[PDB]
Structures are given as structure tokens and as C-alpha cells.
Amino acid sequence: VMRLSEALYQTFFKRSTVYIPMLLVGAYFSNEAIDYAVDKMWTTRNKGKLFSDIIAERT
Amino acid sequence: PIGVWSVFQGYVTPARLPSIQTLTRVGAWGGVVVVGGLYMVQPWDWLA
Amino acid sequence: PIGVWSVFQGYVTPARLPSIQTLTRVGAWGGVVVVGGLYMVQPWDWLA
Amino acid sequence: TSLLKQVALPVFNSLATTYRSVVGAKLAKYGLRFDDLQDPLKDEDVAEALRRLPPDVVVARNCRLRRALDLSCKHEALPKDLLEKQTPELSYLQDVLNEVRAERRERAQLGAPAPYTRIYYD
Amino acid sequence: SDAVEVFKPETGLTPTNRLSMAPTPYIKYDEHNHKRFPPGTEGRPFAYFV
Amino acid sequence: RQNIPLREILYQLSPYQQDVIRQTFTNAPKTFLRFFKEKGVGLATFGVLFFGIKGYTEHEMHQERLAERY
Amino acid sequence: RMHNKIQLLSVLNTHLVAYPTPMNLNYSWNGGSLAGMMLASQMLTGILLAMHYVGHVDYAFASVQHLMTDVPSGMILRYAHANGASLFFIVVYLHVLRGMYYGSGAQPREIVWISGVVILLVMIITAFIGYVLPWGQMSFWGATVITSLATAIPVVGKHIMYWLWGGFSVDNPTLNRFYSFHYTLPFILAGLSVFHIAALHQYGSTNPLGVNSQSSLISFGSYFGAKDLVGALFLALVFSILVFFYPDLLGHPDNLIPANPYSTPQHIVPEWYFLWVYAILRSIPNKAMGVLAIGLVFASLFAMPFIGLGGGKFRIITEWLYWTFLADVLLLTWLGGNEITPITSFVGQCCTAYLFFYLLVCQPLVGYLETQFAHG
Amino acid sequence: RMHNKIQLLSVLNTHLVAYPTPMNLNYSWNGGSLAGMMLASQMLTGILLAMHYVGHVDYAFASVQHLMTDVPSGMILRYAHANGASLFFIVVYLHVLRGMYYGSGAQPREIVWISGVVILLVMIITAFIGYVLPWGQMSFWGATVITSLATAIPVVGKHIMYWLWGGFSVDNPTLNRFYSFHYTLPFILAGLSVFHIAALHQYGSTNPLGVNSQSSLISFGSYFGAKDLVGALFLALVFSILVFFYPDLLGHPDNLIPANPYSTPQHIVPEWYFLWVYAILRSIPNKAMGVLAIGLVFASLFAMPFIGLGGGKFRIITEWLYWTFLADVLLLTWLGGNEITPITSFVGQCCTAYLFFYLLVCQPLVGYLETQFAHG
Amino acid sequence: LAWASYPYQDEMRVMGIKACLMISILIGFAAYSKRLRWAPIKSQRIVMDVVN
């Protein structure tokens, strides 16, 4: 039913030497997004208890 | 008798050598190891 | 199976068991182990 | 022991029929028989009994085992119309295997071995 | 070569012999674990993207 | 490599001509119930024996502690 | 064709890529790959920890602490090693229980079962001498209690005890020789695992149906690589949870006290994976009889392929008795962690007697009755 | 047959008892079994040594002294482990020179030669980092001079150097990680040795005549067991002489001084088996060019099965040139123990140039001329 | 004192949250790639002459 596009296949999928650098940049951005989400959730939950909150409070 | 013996006997002609397309497809692996090393180390904006 | 299945299937008979002379000559290796241990440890007052 | 061992055999027969009923209910969903549960690698007498068989019996046994293994991979059972036709207790091997084991018991009383060994690979 | 001398089949109208002499184009696969796509579905598969 | 005599017709479909995980949601409750139907007796006898012997032992240990009191 | 030109390509292709395997193997057949992966993990993290550990009684605990706090990624490595030992024992115990359930040690796979029992004994010794290396209170006192079982042997007991200690008590030479033996024994485990796997490839694996499977075989590399990856990821999840969220859950708090030979703890207990052997030992009020009972347990494990009849699903009486055996070994695990008490002594004695009854009476005799029921 | 029923006995029989070997092998084919015996001896002595050695600064020297004077049979174990490295290198060097003389790496035994060169590199690294362990002046200063040679690779220099050291100088982290790496590397040596022997068994050994020997093959296990035992007894005589009569003959007296990072010795030279590489490095007046030449020697060693034409006798020009090569290598070994002098620099440069000339020009071109003379 | 026994508890928990999320996504992706490879076998059709 759902099917990968031919023009998108001929560019990023037909050769491994083009597929692998695309894989590495996607891996970089996926790690950045996961880091951002985990850090935002942790800092939101534990607000007011961290050391940086005390330091920014003393300014 | 694999190596210099193959070229002394005349077994390495213009034929049986890799083509330009074959060497380019093998030569395209040079960018993959460069990108992999830059991905592993990540020296961002280190180019001079 | 070969251990207890052979006893239960009736394959272990007196005619198939090793002889008493074979059991005597095989069991004579027990003195060899005793004298080998006595040679290794030498824990005796036997020399006098 | 002989006074109580005269009637210890019908109790054995009743337990055996109950056991075969339960296991044959388990076996029939895979299309298997009781004789298909014997492995030529596990027993050298079964390996000897299997080469004494006509080729069509061996072809049928292999077909049943292949169907059961495919069913086991698919986590399925046989459909109802096939499941009602299954005969888990129709023997094809017990006579030949009983003859093989009797021959081996006969050779052992005279000190002779069996004229076959285990299946050895490599 | 002939199939009677090379494959050496049994004689009869068994289920395997019927498909051997005339195979059917209406092949039914098992669909308990996977439902098939409509036949002749073209295009590079979506599983590469996944 | 171990010739096997067999007569069959085998059919196989391409893995890009069928779905991958969509039937897994339909069959999941049935497979759960089938698993517990097949392994119900063994898990129950395990649970009965383990928790009954553990409970009897812990009860008698508590009685032993109470018997040492003054 | 390319693997036909080099030997090392051919052996790898035959035994990893194109090896035939029964198509109906379920997820109970993943314990071996997981055990191999846990052995590789233990070897890697141990090699990395050995670059910061010092095997001396004045610096062992302090170097452990320094590795925990000051070495970059040292806490991850130390917790990964200490909890990977427990996950290694979990995976191996489940592998052995799979073999006990299906009767996988039977002919023609007696060598596989025997090399497995050898592997398990080496694993037990490796973990026991590795636990002494932090030189905490449990590390000292468990080595004292267990190596004092050699005096149960008459005449030459104390001499073997003093020879193993290097002195009159557990001290620095014991720790140094334990460190050398502990570094060494995992490589013997790797060799034994290679031999154990090459023994199985002679005939192949058994299947969950318990029948001959030579008609339905598929390639190992294309199909069971992904199926092993799935189980490896489920194991990596549990490993991550244990390392990062509950790192001292499977440990003991007394091993964080430095060792004191003049003040014993109130409750000397081993790690959880030695608790059933410890319960067998504590249930019998005689040291020689307890050591003999442990040796007879392992002798019964060696003698399983020759006295055991009875296998998987279609052999239903032994299949039902398997769950009673499993409840018995978990009751032995629980009883080891509890103190000595008349009811725990009685229950441990009954549980040991039932383990012997199942191993030596149920497996031959009930197996023979069900073979006569099914094929007589 | 009894060996036809257990797969372990079949492999052992096939590869150690009934293996067909040429009957005209002389005593220069005993290098490999002697090298394996020396590897096993080093592993045994070291595993025994590690039960009394402490891998920490301010304890390492004292632990070696306590091993020497207080451990029963400890002096024998230490001197055996120290001189066994020298005898191991003597045997492996004579093995390599045999292979150089006979052209043993040629088709179809290129994998055997390549795995040998890999084994030699691992042996060199193992011996160096094991020499660091006693923590004397020679240990510290040799480890300093060699590891601070990564500042020849541009840009990525001192980063790699400081990551190797675990700090800013050779100190306790360097010694502590060198202990773990040195314990671990000989098991890789044993595995590579097993692979190396298994690669030879695909095609069997060459003979002193250099002809096909398939017509005249005899069993290994009867005829070449006693022949190996004779050479092993000669090696045991030399080993016993070295251990008991001249235990410090092959060493350096400066390694009996505790290491001082602020005072350097007058002459810093390695062990004798590293001296030819040291002379090649020290002769060239550039660090990066010296490391490039050292790498080029081993690259030319790897390329030898694909460029080397010419074997033993009946190829007489290359046979004569082998003795010039042997003299060149022994001269480089002598030059490494001297001081830096303009004449010694000139002679070492000429010796390095001739070594490259023989390895890269004589072996292909003179060998091709010999083939054109003999069969042209 | 609870901080002194476990000085890196916060960093360990942040790394554990990231690891659990990543492994949980990878479990689904690996199950997908397992079921894709095994699909021609799980849906194969075998027809034989045996009825029993």
C-alpha cells in the first residue's frame, strides 16, 4: 500500500557510499533530539533543586 | 607466483585491469571513511 | 540412549559383560595410582 | 509378587490407555503419530528399523514431520476437517522395531553385538 | 527430457501430481501471520525507510 | 548433506509483498490466552508449591520468634 | 566461491552463515547466544577494570573507590562488571533449565551436556574468586568460610587449606593468587565455550517438537541473526536498568565496609547465584556430608545423558514433574538467604532430598514408564 | 576405530598422530615446536609470577624483591621468565630466518607467512610492555623514550601520547594499564599460534630439497615426536644454563635501580632482541622518517610472499645473498648497543639501506633472473 | 551522606533514561527487521499427498 518513492530511492538508497553519510547525519540529529528531550524533561521535573538553580537564584 | 610473477609473465594487460568506473566506485569509499572519522571525533569548525 | 536404556532393554547380559580376568587386570591399575601418589608426595617413614 | 502381579496389568493397561488418549489428543493437532516421536539419531535400533521399511512409508513419515514442523513454526494447528481425520495410533514402525530389538536381545545372550552402530557424522 | 524418466513420479491424480501437470495461478499463502499486498504491487518497498 | 526423500510443492512470497507487524496487534490477545492455556498447569503447580512452602516456613519462623519472648 | 579460496572464510561461512537450523526454534533457544555475549561483556569490562585495580590488601578497596569516582566512565564499567556477573548467571541458569526441560542432553549430544557442566563449574569458581577482589567484609569472610571447608577432609585438610591460603589465614598472598587465577579462568571459559559450540554443530540443535528435523532446515546467518538480535536488545534493556537505576540491588551492603579479620558480620551470605549450593551445605549438620552432597549433585548433573529418559511436551508426566523441580531449586535459593532455624533446617533437608529424588529416581524410572506407555 | 566415535579424538588424531609429513625434514624444521614450547613456558611462569607481583608504583620493585628472596622457588620462576623471553626470541628469529632462506612463504603458504608476521608484532609489543613491569630505571626510561615517539604524527601527536600515558608523564596509570595489557596479549598469541598451525596443515610443509614431496610422506606422531624431543632437550640444556649459571648475563644492570623520573642513566638501550629496530630508528636523523622506515620494514615483510622469488639450494645466487642479509641484520643488532657516533651513524645508514635493498630489489629481481636461468 | 555514597546518581539516572528510551525504540525496530526476514517462511504454503 504505502511505498517508497522512486526518485527518493535513486538518490539516497541505491549506493552504499551515499547511504552511509546520510545515515551518519541522521544518527547525529537523532542523538541531539533525544538528548534535548531527556534534558528538558529532567530539568522541568527537578526545577529548584539543582545546583544551577541555586547559583542563578543568588545572582 | 601471485604478485610480481603475474606482471613479469605478461598476465597484466590493459585488459583484466579495473575500469575507470570500477576505480571510481572503489574510490568513492574515500569519503565514507572521512565522514565516519569526522562523525566519531566531531571536531566541529576545526577547518583552519 | 546407552546407559540405563541398555539395562532396561535387556542388552546387558552375563555373556556381554567383561570377564573376571578382565576385571582383575583392569583393577590392577589401582596399585599403580597408589604407588604414583606415594612417589609424588613421598609421605612415608617406609625407607627406614 | 506373583499374587499381586496378576491384576497389576489391567491397571497398567488403563493408565496406558489414558496416557495415549491425552498424548494422542496433543499429537493429532500437529498431524503426528506415536511412531513419528522416535528419532533415528536418538536410537540406533530405530535407525535400523527405519531402513528396513519400504520407500513410500519413509516418504509419508518425512511428509508428516515436515508438516508438523511447519505448523510449529507458524504457531498453528490443523484445521477442523483435517483434525477430525487424524489417526495418531496407526502404527507403521512397531512391528519392525520389535523384531530389531528381539534380534539384538537374542545376539546379546550369545555374546554377540548388534550389527550396526550409532549414526556418526563428519 | 521426459519427467517420467527423470523425476520418476508416482502415477495417479494425487494433489502433488495435479499441480505438477497444471499449476494454478491462484496460489493461496498462509495469512495468519502476514496479510499479502494486492498482487502486482509495484514500487520500491517501504521497509527500507523503516 | 543428508538426502531426505520427500514429495511436496512449496510456495513462498516476497517479504516486500506482505505486511510486517500489522497482524501482530490482532493476534496478541489470542496468543496471550493460548500461552496461558498451554502453560497454565505447570505455572500453577510451581506457584502453589513455592508460595505454600515459603508461607508455611515464614509462619513457623514467626512462631519461633514469638516463642523466645518472655 | 570467494569463501572457497581461504580456509578462515570457509569455516566461518559453514559454521555461522550457511549452517542449517530447525525452522521451528522458539525464543527458548536464545540462551546460548546471550550467554556468549555476556561472557564477552564480562571479559571486556574486566580487562578495562584491570588497568585501575591493585591486588594488594592496602590498596584494593581504595583503588576500587578511586576507579568509582575519579576514573572517567569507571562507575559504568564497575557496575557493568558486577551486574553482568549476575545477568551471566541468570542466562546460564535459564539455558540449563531449558536443557533439563527438553532433555537436550540425550543421545547423540552427551558431549554437549558434559562440556556444559564443566563450563558451569568453571563459571562458579571464576565468580567466587572474583568476589574476593574488592576486599570488603563479605569478600573476606565468605572466602574464609568457604575455603575452611577443606578441613572436612581428614588428615590432609589443614595442609591443603594452608597451601591455598599461603599462610595461616586469609591475607595478602590469598588476594594476589586469587587475582591471578581470576584473570586467567575466563580464557579457559572462552576455550571451553568454543569446544562446547563446535560439539553441538556435529549434529545440530533439537527443536520444540522433540522430533527429527532434518527435513526442515534453514540457514543460520540470514534468519537467526535477527532473532538473536531481538533477545540481545531485551537483555540490554535489563542491563541498562540494573546499571543505571538499581546498581546495588543485587549486591550486599557489607561489601562496602573494608575487611576486618577481628569482627565478623552477623549474617555472612554469598551472592544470590550461590545460595542454593549454600542451602544444600547448611541443611546438613555435617561438613563432610554437605561437601559430598554437593559433589553428588554435580555427579548427577554429569550422569544426566545416561540415566535420563523423558523430554519435552509430549512426555507429560516428566513435563509436569519439571515444574516441581523448578519450585524446589527456587526454594533452595530462598532458603540460603535465611538464618539457621529448626524449620529452615527441616525444609532445606526435605528440599535437598526432593532434588535427589527428582534427579535419580524420577528421570530414569518415570521416563521408562512413559516410554512404555507411548511405544510399548 | 576408537578415535572415529568422538570428534575430539578424530581432530587430535588427524592433526597430531597421523598427519603426513615429508620424511627428509632436517633439524631446522624444529623451530616451530620449540617456539610453541617457549610460549607455553612463558605463560606458565608468568601466571605463577602474577601471584606475587603487585602492579603499583612504590610496591612493584619491593614485590619483585620479595618474589626473589622470600617466595619458595621464586628466584627460579623469575629468572626462567626473564631468560625465556630471550630464548623465545632466539627461536622465533631462527624460525623466520629459515623461512627467509627456503622461501617458505610462497604460494600456497602466504597466509602462514602473514599470520607469522602478525604473531611477531604481537610478540614485540608483549615483550616491551612486560619489560616495563619491574619498574627499574631501564623499564621507566625505555617506556618513556618509546611511547614519546607518537609526537611524529602531525597534529594528532601528544593527544595520543597523553591518552597512552593516562597523564602527562609515564607514571602509575601507565604501569597499571601495562600490567593488564601484558597479561592479556599472550592469550591472543596462543590463539594466533593455533590459527597459524591450522593454516599450514591445509597444504603441509616444504622440504629441504624444495620439490614436491607428496610421494614421500610419513606419519607425524611417531617419527617427529622424538625428533622434536631431542631439540627440546637441547633447548632445556641452554635454558638451564642461562637460569642457574648466568641469570643476569643478557640483562642490564641499570634495571636493578629503582626508577627515578628526575635522573636519567648514561646509556638507554633496550633488550637485545629489540636492538636492530633501535639501530634503524637511531641511525636516521629524523623521528618521523625513522618511524616510517620501521613501518616500511614490516610492510616489506608482509609483502614478501607476493614479491619474493627464490628459495633454498639449487637457487644459488639468492642463497649466497641470504648470508649478506644475515650479516647485515646481525650488524644492526650490534650497532644498537653502541653510542651515537658519526661513523656508527654512517654504518647504520648503510646497513638500513642494504636491508631495504635486499628485501625489495634482490628478492624479486635476482629471483626472476634465477628462474630465467634455470627454466628459461 | 546519601550523596556521599552515590555521588553520580543524577548523571546515572539521566543516562539511564536515555538508554532505556533508545533501547525501547531499538526493540521495536529489531522486531520489525526480524519479522520482515521471517515473513516468506511464516506465510509459506506446503501441499503434500499425506492426509493421515
Ligand SMILES: CCCCCCCCCCCCCCCCCC(=O)OC[C@H](COP(=O)(O)O)OC(=O)CCCCCCCCCCCCCCCCC
Ligand atoms: C506472621 C508473619 C506475617 C507475614 C505476612 C506476609 C507474608 C507474605 C505475604 C502474603 C502471601 C500470601 C499470598 C501470596 C499470593 C501470591 C500469588 C500466588 O500465590 O499466586 C501464584 C499462583 C498463580 O498461578 P498462575 O497465574 O497460573 O501462574 O496462584 C495459585 O496457583 C494459588 C496459590 C495458592 C497457594 C498458596 C496459599 C498461601 C499459603 C499459606 C499457607 C499457610 C499454612 C498454615 C499452616 C499452619 C496453620 C496453623
Ligand SMILES: CCCCCCCCCCCCCCCCCC(=O)OC[C@H](COP(=O)(O)O)OC(=O)CCCCCCCCCCCCCCCCC
Ligand atoms: C540448574 C540449577 C538452577 C539453579 C537456579 C537458581 C535460581 C535462578 C533464578 C533466581 C532468580 C533471581 C533471584 C535473585 C535474588 C534472590 C534474593 C534472595 O533469595 O535473598 C533475599 C535477600 C536477603 O533477604 P534476608 O536475608 O532474608 O533479609 O534480599 C536481597 O538481597 C534483595 C532481593 C532483591 C530481589 C531482586 C529481584 C529482581 C531482580 C532482577 C530480576 C531479573 C529476572 C530475569 C530478567 C532477565 C531475563 C534474561
Ligand code: HEC
Ligand atoms: C562471573 C563471571 C566473571 C567473569 C567471566 C569475569 N569476572 Fe571479573 N568479577 C566477577 C565478580 C563477581 C567480581 C566482583 C564484583 C564486585 O562485587 O565488585 C569481579 C571483579 C573483578 C575485578 C575487581 C574489580 C572490582 O570491581 O571488584 C577485576 C579486576 C576483574 N573482575 C577482572 C576480570 C577480568 C580481567 C576478566 C576476564 C578476562 C573477568 N574479570 C571476568 C565475575 C567475573
Ligand code: HEC
Ligand atoms: C549444563 C548445561 C549447559 C551449560 C552450562 C551451557 N550449555 Fe549451551 N547448550 C547445552 C545443551 C544441552 C545444548 C543443546 C540444546 C539444544 O540444541 O537443544 C546447548 C546449546 C548451546 C547453543 C546453541 C543454541 C542454544 O542456545 O541452545 C549455544 C550457542 C550454547 N549452548 C552456548 C553456551 C555458552 C556460551 C555457555 C556458557 C558460557 C553455555 N552454552 C553453557 C548445555 C549447556
Ligand code: HEC
Ligand atoms: C614471520 C614468519 C613466522 C613467524 C614469526 C612464526 N612462524 Fe612458524 N612458520 C612460518 C612459516 C612460513 C612456516 C612454514 C615453513 C615451511 O613449511 O617451510 C612455519 C611453520 C611452523 C610450524 C611447523 C613446523 C616448523 O617449524 O616448520 C610450526 C609449529 C610453527 N610454524 C609455529 C610457530 C609458532 C608457535 C610461532 C610463534 C610463537 C611461529 N611459528 C612464528 C612462519 C612464521
Ligand code: HEC
Ligand atoms: C614474549 C615475551 C613474554 C611473554 C609471552 C610473557 N611475558 Fe611476562 N614478561 C616478559 C618480560 C621480558 C618481562 C620482564 C622480566 C624482567 O626483566 O624481570 C616480563 C615480566 C612479567 C611480570 C613482572 C614480574 C617480573 O618478574 O618481571 C609478570 C607478572 C609477567 N611478566 C607475567 C606474564 C604473564 C602472566 C604472561 C602470560 C599469560 C606472560 N608474562 C607472558 C615477557 C613475556
Ligand SMILES: COC1=C(OC)C(=O)C(C/C=C(\C)CC/C=C(/C)CC/C=C(\C)CC/C=C(\C)CCC=C(C)C)=C(C)C1=O
Ligand atoms: C543454532 O545455534 C547457534 C546459536 O544459537 C542460536 C548461536 O547463537 C551461534 C552463535 C554463537 C554465539 C553468539 C555465542 C558466542 C560464542 C562463544 C564461543 C562465546 C565465547 C567467546 C568469547 C567470550 C569471545 C571473546 C574473546 C576474544 C575476542 C578474544 C580476545 C581478543 C581480543 C580482545 C582482541 C551459533 C554458531 C549456533 O550454532
Ligand SMILES: COC1=C(OC)C(=O)C(C/C=C(\C)CC/C=C(/C)CC/C=C(\C)CC/C=C(\C)CCC=C(C)C)=C(C)C1=O
Ligand atoms: C560472600 O562470600 C561468599 C561467597 O562468595 C560470593 C560464596 O561463594 C559462598 C558459598 C558458595 C558455594 C557453596 C558455592 C561455590 C563453592 C565453591 C567451593 C567455590 C569454588 C572455589 C574454591 C574451592 C576456592 C579455591 C580456588 C581455586 C582452586 C582457584 C582455581 C584454580 C585452579 C583449579 C587451578 C559463601 C558462603 C560466601 O559467604
Ligand SMILES: COC1=C(OC)C(=O)C(C/C=C(\C)CC/C=C(/C)CC/C=C(\C)CC/C=C(\C)CCC=C(C)C)=C(C)C1=O
Ligand atoms: C631503551 O628504550 C627502548 C625500549 O625500551 C626498553 C624498547 O623496548 C625498544 C623496542 C620497541 C620498539 C621497537 C617498538 C615497540 C612497538 C610498539 C607498537 C610500541 C608499543 C606500543 C604501546 C605500548 C602502545 C600501547 C598499547 C598497548 C599496551 C597494547 C595494545 C593492545 C593490543 C594490540 C591488543 C626500543 C627501540 C627502545 O629504544
Ligand SMILES: COC1=C(OC)C(=O)C(C/C=C(\C)CC/C=C(\C)CC/C=C(\C)CC/C=C(/C)CCC=C(C)C)=C(C)C1=O
Ligand atoms: C613440519 O612438521 C611439523 C613439525 O615439525 C616436526 C612440528 O613441530 C609441528 C607442531 C608441533 C607441535 C604442535 C608440538 C609442539 C608443542 C606446542 C606447539 C605446544 C607446547 C605445549 C606443551 C609442551 C604442553 C602444554 C600443556 C598444557 C596443559 C596446555 C593446554 C591447556 C589446556 C588443556 C587448558 C607440526 C604441526 C608439523 O607439522
